Amino acid sequence: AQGLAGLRNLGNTSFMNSILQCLSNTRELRDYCLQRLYMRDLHHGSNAHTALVEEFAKLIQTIWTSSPNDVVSPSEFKTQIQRYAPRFVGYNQQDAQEFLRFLLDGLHNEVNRVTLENLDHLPDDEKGRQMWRKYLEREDSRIGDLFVGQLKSSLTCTDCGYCSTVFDPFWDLSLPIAKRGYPEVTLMDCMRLFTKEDVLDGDEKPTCCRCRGRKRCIKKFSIQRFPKILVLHLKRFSESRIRTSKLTTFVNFPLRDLDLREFASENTNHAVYNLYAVSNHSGTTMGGHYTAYCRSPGTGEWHTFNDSSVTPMSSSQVRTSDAYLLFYELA
Amino acid sequence: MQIFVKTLTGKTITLEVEPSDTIENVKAKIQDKEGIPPDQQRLIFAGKQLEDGRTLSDYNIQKESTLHLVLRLRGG
Ligand SMILES: [Zn+2]
């Protein structure tokens, strides 16, 4: 019960294997599968996608009952995920974050505990809490328990001073990459690019409905609610209007003590995280190969999962420029 | 109404849309400003990637929501 099984590549499926291994080593998600707790959350009736949760859970069960050097096939799981998300039919190269989003949405939908107003008078935090309650009245699953947080977006009119707030749920954060750092670009620099004051002027002027006209506004994100599992997605793609290229910039991310105090909403308690998994991409935007580096929940040791090959690694080997998705858990 | 898109390098852009706008319409509006073709764009909101053939209203996307624009690193 060490969870060091490899996954067979079925034909350009390293993106899927990398994500599956990151999820396999997401302690609470793994445990939900191993303890069969999903069975009581599945929906009654002939549903086209109950087999998605069942085959995902069976794969995780297989990985965590495997012996040293075992390689298992996720072919039955692939059949189910491509039925939920037909873009994954066949054997083409795909983006791991795209796959992650569709897979978690499919799992969430199948174990959702849910089966079927002007708030200007409220203080910001209470509006946030009410919008959160409204969200959970639609989307309430074990999958969401782990991954979902809430952003606050504050949009201030520079003319009348009105700050319009909205609260957007998130299951991951996709971070722009800073152009250079001193001496290196850090994950915190990228978080700051995400959460900074965005000036909206010129072509981007919003309409202020208090002023009844287009006005220069300042927009800023803060984190109103932190998730148990924080997935950070680095935007490794150039904005070229001719041909995107991959951004291979080293982003220095911490193994431990990722402290997000400075991104929390005003007077909102903040979270600190430790890394437990990384999805790595090597190649171009058009093709390449994925691996995963994952910390075993039980032993705390890191391994490289590269399709059928699972090998031990030092924590000193985990931070690389190939990192694309970072999986953080509360400290 | 207006919604926002957090683009690739730090900026946000502002789109004028209606709830009935299709995801294709939204991607075209992003292309009009950014020169990124719709077939390269992925838009994330509330953990869901928005799909061609659906509308903003299908996702209950309200005024001043932010879509997160992200490209692809294909791998196999
Ligand atoms: Zn105003």
Residue numbers in the entry:
A (entry chain A): 263 to 378, 385 to 599
B (entry chain B): 1 to 76
From the primary publication:
The human genome encodes about 80–90 DUBs, of which the largest of the five DUB families is the ubiquitin-specific proteases (USPs). All of these studies suggest that the inhibition of USP2 may be a good therapeutic approach against cancers. In the present study, 6-thioguanine (6TG), an old drug still clinically used to treat leukemia, rheumatoid arthritis and bowel disease, was identified as a potent USP2 inhibitor. Further studies using enzyme kinetics and X-ray crystallography to delineate its direct binding to USP2 were performed.
